[PDB]
Amino acid sequence: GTVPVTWRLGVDVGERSIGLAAVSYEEDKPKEILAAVSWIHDGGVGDERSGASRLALRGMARRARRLRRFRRARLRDLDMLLSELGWTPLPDKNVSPVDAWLARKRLAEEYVVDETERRRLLGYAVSHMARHRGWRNPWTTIKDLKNLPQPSDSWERTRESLEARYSVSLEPGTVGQWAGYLLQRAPGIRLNPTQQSLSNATAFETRLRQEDVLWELRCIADVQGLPEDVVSNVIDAVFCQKRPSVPAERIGRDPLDPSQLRASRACLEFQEYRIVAAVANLRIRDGSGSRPLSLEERNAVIEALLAQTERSLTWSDIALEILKLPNESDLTSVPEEDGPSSLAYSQFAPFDETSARIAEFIAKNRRKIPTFAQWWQEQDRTSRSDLVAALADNSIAGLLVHLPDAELEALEGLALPSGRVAYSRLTLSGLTRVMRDDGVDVHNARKTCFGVDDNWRPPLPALHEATGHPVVDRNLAILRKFLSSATMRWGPPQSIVVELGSAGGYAAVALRDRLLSYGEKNGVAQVAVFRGGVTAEARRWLDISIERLFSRVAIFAQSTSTKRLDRRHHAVDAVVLTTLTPGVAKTLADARSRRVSASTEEPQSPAYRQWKESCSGLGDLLISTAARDSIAVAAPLRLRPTGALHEETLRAFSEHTVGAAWKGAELRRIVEPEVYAAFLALTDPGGRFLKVSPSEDVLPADENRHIVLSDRVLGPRDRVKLFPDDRGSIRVRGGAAYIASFHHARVFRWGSSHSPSFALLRVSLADLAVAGLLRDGVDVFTAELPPWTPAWRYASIALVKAVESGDAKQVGWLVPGDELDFGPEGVTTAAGDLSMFLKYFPERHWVVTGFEDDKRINLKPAFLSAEQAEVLRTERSDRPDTLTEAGEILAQFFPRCWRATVAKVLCHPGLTVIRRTALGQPRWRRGHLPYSWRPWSADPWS
RNA sequence: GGAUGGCAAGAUCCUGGUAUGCUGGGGAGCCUGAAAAGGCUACCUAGCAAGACCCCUUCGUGGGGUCGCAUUCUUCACCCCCAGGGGGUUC
DNA sequence: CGCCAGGTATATACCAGGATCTTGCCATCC
DNA sequence: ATACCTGGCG
């Protein structure tokens, strides 16, 4: 079903956008622009204001959940430890706010005599300390915490500052002492500081260290006379912290054996592998040489490198002191099969760094590790290998033989080489055995152990596998969708050109490799990437002006080039990129910098004249193509019903008596859905929906009003909980929380065909949550939401009377980002500040951004860039008078653009909501992927 | 313009934690009130997405573990990849 | 009320140190 | 930035 055509692909990668183009060629001459679209993605940003990516915000929330859960676990274990001890935690209720501190300071000052009062005061103190234990390095241990200066340097300075500030010195004194004393002397004092950006005085500057809290705990242990047993146990209980780790899923796998994980660099197998590979590439002068090394010489230098305790032996030392060759020039190396030969004689040869680090650690700290020292003496290298890998894999998760503890806690103070290596451990071991037994290069050892071509590079990643970087993946997803659809509609491309704007250098390498795998699979002659501004010179030396290509008005009181203005330029950059070859971009990019840094008109060369004569046609191809409005700006749609279910701040409920008078606002606010349905029945007995207008009473103060429920019957003085605010809300964890942003909106309409009324139902994730519609197999856009859901509670009253009367039916659904093409007739309901905007920017393509209230929808122009308009707005307020009238208009408009009344939007015969293919062509057929439709005339659901 | 050894900085997440914050439950100090009932500034305590599942059972009517704000066309339908994950759908 | 148009609240900020990546620099050998 | 508030003007 694909018609083969000779074409070229062009990609222009931006920070928040990507320009894609498929262009057919004659010979090397462009005849027609098959497709040219500029997709506008978000860069993976989840909170636009923070800048945090969606992925990051998710991970933060995940780790917060697990922090809370582990804290629950250790606190319940602490309660279990100080039950059998005989102590008593702080009860949740009925205590004094200053009992914990009064405890923690008396226990550190005086010896409490009564054993019961001692035990409860201790229970108070340790319970509170575990609940407020301070900070420490997650990688260190409790026995490591015990070995730090106690008290802290920060705490000693804070304490000296407090002693001079409050004119009192406290022995010893602990942070509990100063806290309880300041909560006595100057009440209302805040302990740790905070910033919320006004006027207040705190008691502490820096975060308190767990070492200070442990210091206070041992002060109490000394003063109260506690045995070594229980004091050690309770410190291990209060400062119990899970040790950080990498999950085994995040380590790369070995390309030669994908069943195995990348080894640690500290690995003994790797140290041997590196030395054996370094020597296996050595050659010795025999004339008019050269020769491989004899088995004896190779073993000699391998053992000489393995045994050394420092990295001192150079290659000159190998060539003279070991191989006994006359001069250093008689030894060289060859790195590749059929490649050049060189060797720096001054450089050092590799050595086993981990065995040497263990050697110096044993020689320095031998008293502390007597059995390990003797162990690593006589054990052969196959056992040492497993031990070193166990040390590395427990030092990063991630045992093994006859381990005494006393030595083991010093063995964790050992610094081994960090980082991982390309190949697995068993792979290194096998490659060394073949290189040692057969005296052979690494490239032939590869073939001996595994069946592999000569030579072969480790496999390059494909398009359908991610980069982990959220900014690069938006580009990757759009690109692979476009390229798949282009290979299906037309032929596979002949050339692929990509341009980037180290932040995008990684993006360059990732995109390049994935397109290289694509090319060697589907057969593309040339695939090139370029940095960074090759297209700007290509254009403005071929006289392609983007404000002249698209007839757009001047913007400044100057004659500046407004190229970032129209978001279609990404596409046109793509289309011009398809005309390039590495040499032409070479000679153009040189000239750009040659000019911008240092009569006069430039350049010309045999490739440049050929390029220009072959590409002369584009000047008019672009005019014709932009005239027919063939260039499309698109925004991908977010349909997945995932994200924040509700706003995060819990809010306190209000209450309302059943017998009192009600208004519409107070009835929409009823929390219980059963109580809600009861009052909806009392407001209209045959009604399915709440048809009340807020700000206006609908029920009297019926003194004998009862509402019968299957739970219970309520009396006229009973109280029912109400949400705090007359806005879409839900109940989570005993509080009220506003719904989050709307997932989508459903477009209903009713009335005559020649003049119909429209309305929107603003559907949120809280709506789908309470309706239990997040199960499998649900269509979130057409699945009835009960009348109690916040969506129906806050629909337009016109809508809720029209839907219950059966006249209104769901006709479509809108989701943030999709496109509103008002066709050739354009916005006719223009009024106010919008119309003065349309006199200078005649925009017909609009993008949905939100659903502000129960009667409006938020639209931004699709072709104009928000960031450039912000540039203008910040510019006029700092440098005024430097704008045209259209510049002032564009500056004032864009922060919120069109905040349109839905009534004045959907009343456009034919207006099309456009849903594009990756190639930028509107789907018209009512297929399984989302498709275009017209609100004025579209078959209702079912 | 190649090869090799080393250094530094940056980027993206991942793991474990620290203070705040919010709601519920408390009460040291305090200001308005003849009250009566509510605000203040701190501190103590539980929880922090709604939820979906497993496991071990000594069967405790109680306990241990995972997933839950990413992968921008949900769900339904076709075409693909090396029996679970990842992709594409031309207007 | 229909239709605009201004104004404003949202959870937020640290830590050390792995895994996965990129640039830029230094030096010594062809 | 998004979804709330108030409020003018007819």
Numbering used by the authors: 7 to 203, 210 to 410, 416 to 518, 682 to 778, 791 to 1134
What does the study report here?
Here we further characterized the PAM recognized by AceCas9 and report crystal structures of AceCas9 without its HNH domain (AceCas9–ΔHNH) bound with a guide RNA and DNA targets. Similar to other Cas9, AceCas9 contains the conserved RuvC domain that is connected by the arginine-rich bridge helix (BH) to the nucleic acid recognition domain (REC) and the PAM-interacting domain (PID). We show that AceCas9 contacts the 5′-NNNCC-3′ PAM by forming a network of hydrogen bonds with both the cytosine and guanine bases.
The structure of the ternary complex was solved by a combination of molecular replacement and single-wavelength anomalous diffraction methods and refined at 2.9 Å to crystallographic residual factors of 0.22/0.26 (R/Rfree) (“Methods”). In the final model, we were able to place 949 of the total 988 protein residues, 91 of the 94 sgRNA94 nucleotides including the first triphosphate nucleotide (G1), and all of the DNA nucleotides. The ternary complex crystal structure reveals specific interaction of the 5′-NNNCC-3′ PAM with AceCas9 residues in its PI subdomain. Specifically, the carboxylate group of Glu1044 contacts the exocyclic amino of C4* on NTS and the guanidinium groups of Arg1088 and Arg1091 contact the exocyclic oxygen of G(-4) and G(-5) on TS, respectively. In addition, Arg1091 establishes a salt bridge with Glu1044 to further enhance the Glu1044-C4*-Arg1091-G(-5) network of interactions. AceCas9 residues directly contact C4* of the nontarget strand and G(-5)-G(-4) of the target strand. Accordingly, methylation of C4* but not C5* abolishes the DNA cleavage activity of AceCas9.
